[PDB]
Every structure is written in C-alpha cells, then in structure tokens.
C-alpha cells in the first residue's frame, strides 16, 4: 500500500527543516543587529527512483544582547516537491526559529535552538490503474536543541557537536477519490539526532572570510511517519563558504553543502544579504 509518499514526503521535509535549523545557528556564529534574509535551495535524490526540491524565504535578526550573549529569532516560509514513482508531494510551510548562543570568553561556547513550524501537504498519488487518490494532510515540526562548541587555532579551526530532538505532530486525514485511498490516524513522533561538524575558515583579506566544512550525523533513535488503517540512517556532509564586506553595514554570505549516504545524496545552497546596525 502506498502511504509510502506520506511517510516519505513528511520525512523529506522533516530532513529538509532541520537544515533551517542550521542556518540561524550560522546567524548567531558571525555591533548589535545584524539584519539579514536568507534562501536556501535544497536539491536530493533517494534512489523507481526517488528526488526532491526545496525553497525557504526568511528573514530574522541576531541581536548581541551583551557581554558574550548572542540572541537570534528568525521567520521565514518554505515550499517543497517530492516526486517518486506514482506519487507526488507538494508542502508548504511556515516556521519561527530563535538561537541563543552563549559565550565562554574566548574558547567555546552554547547554543540553546529552537522551532515551531505549520506545514500541510497536498499529497497525490496513482493509486490505482487510470485512478487518481489525493489527500490533504496538515501537522507540526517542533525542533529543540542543544550544542556546543571550541575555538581552536592567520586561519581557524572549529569542532562542535550536539543534539536535536525533532517533534512531529501530524493531524487526521482522508484521501479522496479512489476507494482504495487510506483514512490517517494522527502521529505523534519525536527523534534524537547526533550532531558532530568540523568547520576550516582560512581568511582572505580583512574584509572578507574563506571556510571548509565537514561533519557527520546520526539518528540515537527510531523516526518512522507512516499512518494508520526503505529509508536509511547515518549521513556524512562536507561544504564550503564565505562571507564577504561590501560597505555601509552591508554584506554578502555564502554557503553550499553536500550530505553524503549510500542512497541518498543531497545540495544544499545558502545566500543572502545583511545590515549591521
């Protein structure tokens, strides 16, 4: 029985969502504000064979709230396709995230994180000969947590790692039009994950800053989606950036990264501008 889309898609974009993440973690790491607006382009394949595409706007600030605190709450959307072989996944989303990185003097420090995120799909699937089944889903991302970090040693190094607890509320559903189509029961789901990036930032001038990223991260426990009456683990990632100075506040950032399995690679490719005030 197909369900496999919705199990698929939701994790598709549950994956997806713990990348934004990742970025407002990046908008604490860089004077108080820092306005800044962001898009991040995601683009995987799973495999019949699966694939992925992904959009987020997003606009939030990161406030220096004194000596050695940093405080960070961004807002933005997202929309997101999933095609397999009958079945396709359109979402659409909207999330508040906020960041809190404290400081101990100059050799690491912590990062409380969190999200609250809406997303629906609208799921469509061949799920029959010549007989169309479509459905309208709706649920909750809700992402907490914790990470730390070292300044290590022109050019710098940096190790860091922590956990993510990932909870995934998804509403009651029907999938209207062939009779073969299911009837969801809700879900409630929740997830621990390892986190653990190594970060290489050699500098170029002093106006603009050069890095190398890689690190690794694992699931401590089951994440499952599927509803009622394939999917692998461990991923290696690598990237490259940097952020650049044009002026009178203004600058750039650049980011890319490559998320490394056997049987599912994904791109994920940040940009965007910034005023320091």
Not at 6 to 29: E, I, P
Not at 228 to 244: E, K, Q, S
């Amino acid at each position: 029985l197909a369900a496999t889309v919705y199990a698929d898609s939701t994790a598709a974009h549950a994956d997806m969502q713990g990348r934004r993440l990742k970025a407002v973690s990046d908008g604490l790491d860089h004077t108080g504000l820092r306005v800044i607006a962001q898009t991040q382009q995601d683009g995987g394949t799973w495999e019949v064979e699966g694939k992925m595409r992904g959009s987020t706007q997003t606009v939030g600030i990161a406030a220096k709230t004194g000596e050695n605190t940093t405080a960070a709450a961004t807002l933005g959307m997202g929309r997101s396709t999933w095609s397999e072989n009958s079945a396709n996944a359109k979402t659409d989303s909207i999330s508040l995230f906020a960041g809190i990185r404290h400081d101990a003097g100059d050799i690491g420090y912590l990062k409380g994180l969190f999200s609250y995120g809406r997303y629906k799909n609208s799921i469509s699937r061949s799920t029959g000969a010549d007989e169309h089944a479509e459905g309208s889903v709706n649920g909750t991302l809700m992402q907490l947590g914790a990470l730390g970090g070292v300044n290590v040693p022109t050019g710098d190094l940096t190790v860091e790692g922590g956990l993510r607890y990932d909870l995934l509320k998804q509403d009651a559903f029907a999938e209207k039009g062939s009779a073969l189509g299911w009837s969801g029961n809700s879900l409630t789901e929740g997830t621990l994950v390892g986190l653990a990036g190594l970060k290489l930032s050699q500098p170029l001038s002093d106006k603009a800053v050069l890095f190398a990223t890689a690190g690794v991260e694992r699931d401590l426990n089951g994440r499952d989606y599927t509803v009622t009456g394939n999917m692998p683990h461990t991923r290696l990632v690598a990237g490259l950036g940097a952020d650049v100075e044009f002026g009178n506040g203004w600058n750039g950032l650049a980011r890319y990264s490559y998320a490394g399995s056997k049987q599912y690679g994904n791109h994920s490719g940040r940009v965007g501008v910034g005023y320091r005030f």
